[PDB]
Amino acid sequence: EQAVPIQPVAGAALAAPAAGQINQIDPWIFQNFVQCPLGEFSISPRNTPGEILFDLALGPGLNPYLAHLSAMYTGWVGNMEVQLVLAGNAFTAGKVVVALVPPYFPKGSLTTAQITCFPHVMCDVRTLEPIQLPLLDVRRVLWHATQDQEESMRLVCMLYTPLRTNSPGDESFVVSGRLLSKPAADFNFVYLTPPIERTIYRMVDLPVIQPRLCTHARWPAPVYGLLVDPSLPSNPQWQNGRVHVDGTLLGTTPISGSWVSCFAAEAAYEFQSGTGEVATFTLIEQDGSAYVPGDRAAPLGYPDFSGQLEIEIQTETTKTGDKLKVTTFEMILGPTTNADQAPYQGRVFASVTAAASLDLVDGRVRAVPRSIYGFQDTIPEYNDGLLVPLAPPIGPFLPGEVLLRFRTYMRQIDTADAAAEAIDCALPQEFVSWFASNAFTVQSEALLLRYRNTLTGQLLFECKLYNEGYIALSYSGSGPLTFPTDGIFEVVSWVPRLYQLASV
Amino acid sequence: EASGQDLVPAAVEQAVPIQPVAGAALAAPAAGQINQIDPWIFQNFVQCPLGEFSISPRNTPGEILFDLALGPGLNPYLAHLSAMYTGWVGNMEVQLVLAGNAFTAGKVVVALVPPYFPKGSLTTAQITCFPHVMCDVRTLEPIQLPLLDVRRVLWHATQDQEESMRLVCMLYTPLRTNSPGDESFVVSGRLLSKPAADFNFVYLTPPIERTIYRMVDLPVIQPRLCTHARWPAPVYGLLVDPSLPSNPQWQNGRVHVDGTLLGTTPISGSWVSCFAAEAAYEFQSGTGEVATFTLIEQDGSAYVPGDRAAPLGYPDFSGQLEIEIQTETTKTGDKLKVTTFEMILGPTTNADQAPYQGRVFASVTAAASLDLVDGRVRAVPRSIYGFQDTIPEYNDGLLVPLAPPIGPFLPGEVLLRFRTYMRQIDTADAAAEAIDCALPQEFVSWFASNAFTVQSEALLLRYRNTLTGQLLFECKLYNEGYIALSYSGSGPLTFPTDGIFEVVSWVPRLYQLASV
Amino acid sequence: QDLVPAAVEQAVPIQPVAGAALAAPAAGQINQIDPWIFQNFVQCPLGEFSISPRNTPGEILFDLALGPGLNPYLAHLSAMYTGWVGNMEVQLVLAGNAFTAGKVVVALVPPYFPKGSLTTAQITCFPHVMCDVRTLEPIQLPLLDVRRVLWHATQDQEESMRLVCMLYTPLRTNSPGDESFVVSGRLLSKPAADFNFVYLTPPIERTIYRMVDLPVIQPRLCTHARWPAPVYGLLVDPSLPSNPQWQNGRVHVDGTLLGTTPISGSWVSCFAAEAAYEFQSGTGEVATFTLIEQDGSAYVPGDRAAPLGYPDFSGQLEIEIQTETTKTGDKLKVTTFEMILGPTTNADQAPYQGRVFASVTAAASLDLVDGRVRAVPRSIYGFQDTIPEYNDGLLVPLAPPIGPFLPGEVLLRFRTYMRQIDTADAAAEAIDCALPQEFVSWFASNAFTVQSEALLLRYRNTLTGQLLFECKLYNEGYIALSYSGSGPLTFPTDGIFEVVSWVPRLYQLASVGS
Ligand SMILES: C[C@H](CCC(=O)NCC(=O)O)[C@H]1CC[C@H]2[C@@H]3[C@H](O)C[C@@H]4C[C@H](O)CC[C@]4(C)[C@H]3CC[C@]12C
Ligand SMILES: C[C@H](CCC(=O)NCC(=O)O)[C@H]1CC[C@H]2[C@@H]3[C@H](O)C[C@@H]4C[C@H](O)CC[C@]4(C)[C@H]3CC[C@]12C
Ligand SMILES: C[C@H](CCC(=O)NCC(=O)O)[C@H]1CC[C@H]2[C@@H]3[C@H](O)C[C@@H]4C[C@H](O)CC[C@]4(C)[C@H]3CC[C@]12C
């Protein structure tokens, strides 16, 4: 190892009296260096001193073996050993500082003038052998708990003295550094309990379902292909199909795939001597519950696209030539208002253009959409002309990155062309349901996906799934680019935000 | 020693896989004082305040017989001493007493759940993974277990609830009997506990009587001197009746044992079925004199419709009710005069009325107009006609917050009633409903002004007669605010009103009471 | 045979508590301090308390928490370490006369005691020392460290053994009274023999236990927090209502901004919006504004009453707007617009919902197009100090009124004059604010930790060194003064403020008058 101004720290010699058991580990784990997650960095000549290369906290998450073994235990104590590996030839200059931050330290930005005060080591970029460091366990309690995120001593590495090298015309230069770790000879678990599957250290996975069979979240119709292009606005404001990875729903996205673009309301029918009878709908949640205004722009499943739409609402007739019928009503959701539709307050109006006043009975009807007229990709009038709370627009994106859109086609009334519409969304419905049900634990920033074919095994492209619930690609073209609907998404690992993908 | 030993007792085999744990040898140099417990406490086993359980053939595998959290709440000596100190460490010894008959069969498991384990199901498949001990319901000698203390801090705090090692016992194999005749035995098991050799408190604090542990106690007064919680009259009888509906929705005399009040139960005893309002009078050549009431609470506060169905003390029955009111008259000679007004409950028209909306109508027959003035009055009941013990409408036809119906009950359990039937010749009622309630007003006041802390689910009470000093029965008091007892009869059963209720111990919901 | 004396000195018996002997095998380092701190008593940051005959038995005079915040040397040294273990000692002095009679108690409440209420019959059960008001010599007490964790953390307040004193016997004077005699009392503290920090750390300057300071700026060269004009007066007046509900110039001492207060001094009373214009048939040019934040960020309704910087006073406002025109002869013009904010109800005003309507009488027609513009106030008509129509006619979340002044206490006001449009009277209106600009600033730029309830200030001249008055600054961000007159009183503006210490809620100021 290396000399560091710190005292030896006791491990299991302190927690033995106050713990029921002390459990050993397989001895073949103390002899292997396994890469820690998020333990990679790349230094480039354009970087400036003071950039935080990486930081990570001591725990059972620094080793897949320990992270898996910590499901049937309760606590853990002890120190670990860490190895830093740098790639660089003998025509390089620069220096990097590696420190040992104490646990209870304020969270903020560290300038290069402050990082050196901690017990630290200084490493050149020309170093040949890997650099070894200890990672003790400084605490105030006898042992930690495996199901709680406590405070533990961290490791922070930041660039100290910048890099000076020449560069060819193709790949300028990148000094790559990687981190490995292993438990020391003083690591022990505490109490044996029956295994728990839904633990905190669970890698995120995705359902094995091809995109051709998914269900769109903005309109009840199957997905008919996915694509990416820069023509459309970079930051839309869709209120359906938004979800966090951790399992919290934003906007007005419903849990099931049948509530989309449909609403439940109590109806009141009153004949009007002009166009026809007029129905006023007081909205109510689909499951059946009082609707009160809040942070949601509308009741769950309400449409989030502007245009002219019609629905079927299971009419009833008290006249004697029949008892129950279904006929098409009329709805207006486009811009320019000219109506008194207040979904936020729970009040909608509908009408049918027909004479010979009908006989109707109010029957707390449902509603299912049929088709649209004049689709516009803007939000509708949630209030009269006021502002209502809503989800933030999708963004921001790294330069040269573009959103991936799942696309479907609508039914049209236009008398000019019948090509497409075509409605886009960020995620299909089953992904939303999966993320809502499982409720994973987000680790750092984002996931690295891979859209590989099932049979041949060749890889199509690499995409990044941000924590906010959208997928971005490193595309630098000019025209629309579609993709096949056969491959299966996979999860690679967590990556930092400032990660550069492979261009497609 | 004992008689024929065709039984098991060989407990011996504990062999629990756990290391010894240091007690007060750790917290000694981090506490400001020195303390010790009376050495005669460490010597004799005594019953825990939650040391009663019963195994019955109606149970199924997977039912949690009992659970215990390590602390001062497992010993009356330590429970009493916990009000004078702050913090505790150490282990305990627990004796479990099962003495089932020689005709029974079954097996139970005792586990040692570690701290921080999530609370919830704990099915039968998981209980054996912890360090566990097998037991038979036919063992003779008491079974001894150690209850150690596993922690990470030096000492816990007596106030609030920390996380410490638990003891959970669940029925593994169902209990059945081979007795040839007519019945299946129910095994009653007891618990005892004493501090280990290294128990100690930490810091001295003023003795505050209102402690988190404490122990629920009942007022020592006979039910015959109580006052009813639904009508201004004394309690006249104690009744059990299976014929009448067993899940009412009464809105008075309902109060949690931890202090919270539900429904429209007033704290005082004179607020029942009485209401204060602002009243405006007028004359109609039909009904006579009609008066509009806007109600407010009796103290003098304003009314705002909240999570309560009606102002506190409002009646919660149906029928025609006649009240006595005080009015001031303009004409000479008579200036103050008492009158008898009357109103019905359900007239349903565009006159609901809506006590939820603070609006009420009253009418009195009078051919000649009475010169009356606007005023503020208080109304107290005088007579009833056509009384139905069903919840009346409060709003127009909408839904209003309401207390949940009294329940649920175990099979064979019946709800006790503080009730009076006095036989009488009725005029218009074919279903004679007489006066009833669930608890008297004294109990409501006691529970509201004491604010106890519940422990598991319910209390075990015994109704002991005071003249001769023999028990009459035992009942289960659910901490939701009602009393139940086992009864499988057909007709009503009445009880004397000379006993005084006692409190024995806490108990879970699935306790099987003795028949009566 | 024995002898039991009837006069024994007061003492508190203690059992030694291990300090670094426990945290050594689980802390990275154990750092000692200068060995000449253990030999001197220093005033604590919270070291002021006062006893008055207005008090009643059973009142909590003061309470302190064991930690590095009880000594200026330790408060300074704590900026470069992480943990600490050990005990201290606290000395108490009272400035009592030979006429006042009374007794107080000092008790060492242990940690995790339910922080409810204490009666006079309970405080005496803890290890306690009984003090008389008439004592001359200071009295000292120890303060052990009773804990369950190995070593505390500086950045977390946590729970530690307290020291709370309370009035035992009511204070009474042989004089007829009621008088204004108050007994002052001060505290000092010093580390015991077993104190040391834990981990070494680069010295940060923005941390807890950092003494609050104020900018050295005379009020003449400051800026009003409710109008773009310099401060023109400093005054106190009891005729006006003593519980205003201004929505501007409100900031906590810690840095939490309350209401619609903007950080900069140039955002006040002015806003920015996307504006659409439309002509009429006699009304004139009617312009509809959708409000946005001054920096261009979108506005979303929330718990804030209105967009930042919106005016919160009733009346008719004349504003200046930059527009671009269509007809030839000119391109860009500046136009005067009218705005209605008071409870007129003859309009559709909802700054909460981000809709604003403005009008001008006419010039000729003046066809102008939509544009993103910024509105700055120019003139005011019909001033009434009442909250305007934030919603149409409904309610809106608002900052609470000031409160809760003790009896005999009033609020200090900073007075700034207006630009008035009037026909009858030539008097100039004035606006009172609780704090000026550069005082809402210098807050939310520093993470000050309150650590107590009230902060005691002091006003004095620069070149004369003469005290003018003492004022109490509450946590919520207003200045309280002890005045008992009838008419308004103004003060010279050339003085400067300076912090003194932290004082509890029940501190009694010194009466001022003329
Ligand atoms: C008459 C309709 C059923 C047929 C219909 O109109 N649509 C069915 C379809 O097309 O899927 C009735 C059947 C059950 C009714 C629902 C259920 O009773 C539950 C619920 C009850 C609330 O009071 C009103 C909404 C809500 C949600 C009701 C809306 C109307 C429903 C859906
Ligand atoms: C002068 C009247 C007495 C009227 C009276 O004799 N009423 C008898 C009756 O209600 O029948 C006084 C006696 C008690 C007073 C009330 C109590 O003293 C206090 C109460 C609460 C507030 O302090 C003020 C209102 C309110 C509600 C008081 C209103 C005026 C009352 C009602
Ligand atoms: C209010 C000011 C115009 C100022 C002016 O000419 N007269 C008003 C005054 O003097 O205050 C508006 C007009 C144009 C606006 C800009 C543009 O409309 C848009 C532009 C977008 C950038 O991303 C950031 C803001 C930025 C840069 C805007 C800042 C505010 C500006 C500069």
Numbering used by the authors:
A (entry chain C): 27 to 530
B (entry chain B): 15 to 530
C (entry chain A): 19 to 532
What's the paper's own text on this?
The T=3 icosahedral calicivirus capsid is composed of 180 copies of VP1 with a molecular weight of ~58 kDa, which is divided into the N-terminus (N), the shell (S) and the C-terminal protruding (P) domain (1–5). The S domain forms a shell around the viral RNA genome, while the P domains form protrusions emanating from the shell comprising A/B and C/C dimers. The P domain is further subdivided into P1 and P2 subdomains, with the latter containing the binding sites for cellular receptors and neutralizing antibodies. At conditions found in the gut (i.e., low pH with high metal ion and bile salt concentrations), the P domain rotates and drops onto the shell with intra P domain changes that enhance receptor interactions while blocking antibody binding.
Once the sequence of the purified mutant virus had been verified to contain the V339I mutation, the structures of V339I apo, V339I + 2 mM CaCl2, and V339I + 10 mM GCDCA were determined from that same sample. The calculated resolutions for all three cryo-EM reconstructions were ~2.7Å. The positions of the P domains are essentially identical and are in the activated state, resting on the shell surface. The overall RMSD of the alignment between these two structures is ~0.4Å, well within the margin of error at this resolution. The only apparent differences between the two structures are in the outermost loops that are more than likely due to inherent flexibility. The correlation coefficients are calculated during real space refinement in PHENIX and represent the agreement between the refined model and real space density. These outermost loops become more ordered with the addition of GCDCA or Ca2+ (the color shifts from reds/yellows to blues/greens), which is likely due to the stabilized positions of the G’H’/C’D’ loops (insets in Fig. 5A through C). The addition of activators (i.e., GCDCA or CaCl2+) decreased the mobility of this P2 domain as per the improved CC. Therefore, while the V339I mutation alone is sufficient to push the P domain nearly into the fully activated conformation, the addition of these activators finishes the activation process and stabilizes these key loops.
